[model samples]
Target chain A: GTKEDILERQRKIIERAQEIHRRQQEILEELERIIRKPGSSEEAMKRMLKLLEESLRLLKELLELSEESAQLLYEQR
Target chain B: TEKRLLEEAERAHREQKEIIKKAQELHRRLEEIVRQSGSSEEAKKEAKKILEEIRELSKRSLELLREILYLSQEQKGSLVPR
Candidate 1:
């Protein structure tokens, strides 16, 4: 309980980013089920898919930066 | 079905703001650690500057989520309620 510190925060940040990515992927899959059908679709589905994909990419990049910052912290010691 | 999708978007926006707030808090703490880190001042400045990119992407992610919500709203309104 008393171990709260810098690395722990970094770990939580990374975990949060990963959780966002996982949930975003889930949403994207749901969007895909509606859009990719051959019989019918809306312009909005495609657009939303693109937005979700970009958001996923951004989440991944955020995770990368979080990892980088954590490494920098380790080297400080 | 469309309503369910909107519900998800709504929930996501809510959670997005939550994560962003906490992330900002943690980000500030670690960035200061970098600032007080044992390095040349120039090096510290560059590292912090690079880390600043996190803020940029976070803003973009939030914008993208808003767009998703808007699109979902439009989709719900425009479609035939079959």
Candidate 2:
């Protein structure tokens, strides 16, 4: 039962990681698109920064979760 | 002097909590995007790579924060000239 619990938590982490990855890519594409446009306005730049902020937040959470799972797995071994 | 150090630490900790809260919301939206079926394999791979980049950035950010806390905790005597 204890082992199953660990595996279930591990599964959820992967699902969450994948979701974050998708958004990360989407935001990067949008940022690139905005940069390619000539004379992108201040408002457009601000929007890009907002997306960047979201991307950073997602990345931080994913990193923490991945590290936590690895530490648990190591201890279990 | 010690009060200032403690206050800085508290401020950093508070900011960190706010960052985590925002991360949770951002993660929720990403999860929704992954559940949808329109994303292509190539796009998914690109996303995965970008995710790795973000992980690296976050690692550095946390490391810098730790350095700040370490500096704040260091003894004042360590820097005094005899």
Best by lDDT: 2
Q: Residue-wise lDDT of candidate 1 within B17-48, one digit each (tens)?
A: 55554444534443343335413345334534
lDDT of 2 by residue, B5-64 (tens): 444544544454454455545434434334442144443444345445445444443543
CAPRI band of model 2? incorrect
**What is each model's TM-score for chain A?**
0.50, 0.86
Per-residue lDDT over A1-77 for candidate 1, one digit per residue giving the tens place of the 0 to 100 score: 43346446544554465566556445434434433334533354344435444544555465454445334333432
Worst 10 residues of 1 chain A by lDDT: A68-77
Question: Model 2, chain A: how large is the TM-score?
Answer: 0.86
Give me the runs in candidate 1 sitting further than 4 Å from their true place. Answer: A1-3, A53-57, A64-68, B1-82
Using DockQ, give the best candidate's number.
2
What is the fnat score of candidate 2? Answer: 0.02
Which candidate number has the best TM-score?
2
DockQ of each: 0.02, 0.04
